[PDB]
Amino acid sequence: MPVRRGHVAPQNTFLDTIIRKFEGQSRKFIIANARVENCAVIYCNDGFCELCGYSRAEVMQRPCTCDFLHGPRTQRRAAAQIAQALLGAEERKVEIAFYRKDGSCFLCLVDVVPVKNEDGAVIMFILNFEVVMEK
């Protein structure tokens, strides 16, 4: 019987301890369709949103190339590996240095793999994340 209680106060000491665990406790996952309407991901696990600390309407409309997370200072191999990997839709993973909402930065690996059906017909593509250099 959780009471509402019309109050408010600071509390990010212990609740923040689980935040570091969620990083892997639920990992990340994103799926994209070859028929991209706006050239963006179709679905993104709650984790992805929790990682980029963005809004639901801001995470459900971003490219699978982490372009919004890439810059002129980030490795180019990332944008290339992703671009080439998408052009062929073949199993290919690449590490990219993205920035978080906390101001911190780290390198996360992104594997791209197509999703065929019972007939082996690749309809859409799925991608998975994997921390490699958590600075």
Side-chain angles (χ1 to χ4, degrees), residues 3 12 28-30 34 37 48 57 62 66 68 71 79 82 111 120:
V3 67
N12 236 135
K28 314 292 164 258
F29 144 66
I30 51 271
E37 170 158 51
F48 194 107
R62 302 227 88 81
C66 312
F68 79 110
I82 295 291
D111 189 11

Side-chain angles (χ1 to χ4, degrees), residues 15-43:
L15 234 169
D16 185 51
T17 309
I18 302 162
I19 301 300
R20 174 169 250 166
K21 171 155 267 238
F22 199 44
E23 97 189 317
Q25 196 66 30
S26 85
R27 69 147 140 180
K28 314 292 164 258
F29 144 66
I30 51 271
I31 182 266
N33 65 339
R35 278 270 133 183
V36 283
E37 170 158 51
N38 269 299
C39 208
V41 62
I42 292 296
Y43 232 89

Side-chain angles (χ1 to χ4, degrees), residues 1 9 19 45 52 91 103 110 113 117 124-125:
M1 267 125 197
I19 301 300
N45 186 31
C52 51
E91 54 230 329
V110 188
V113 180
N117 54 30
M124 53 260 200
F125 333 123

Side-chain angles (χ1 to χ4, degrees), residues 29 109 120 134:
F29 144 66
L109 232 162
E134 206 226 278

Side-chain angles (χ1 to χ4, degrees), residues 55-108:
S55 210
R56 188 143 243 180
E58 294 182 56
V59 188
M60 294 254 257
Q61 70 175 225
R62 302 227 88 81
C64 253
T65 318
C66 312
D67 178 23
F68 79 110
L69 282 163
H70 184 273
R73 235 162 153 284
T74 302
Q75 303 319 298
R76 178 192 127 165
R77 71 199 72 170
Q81 276 15 274
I82 295 291
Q84 165 45 223
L86 196 118
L87 171 148
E90 182 177 38
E91 54 230 329
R92 163 58 133 182
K93 80 180 83 220
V94 58
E95 66 192 327
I96 329 92
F98 74 104
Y99 273 39
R100 241 249 302 195
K101 299 306 102 231
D102 202 9
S104 10
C105 76
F106 3 73
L107 266 84
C108 254

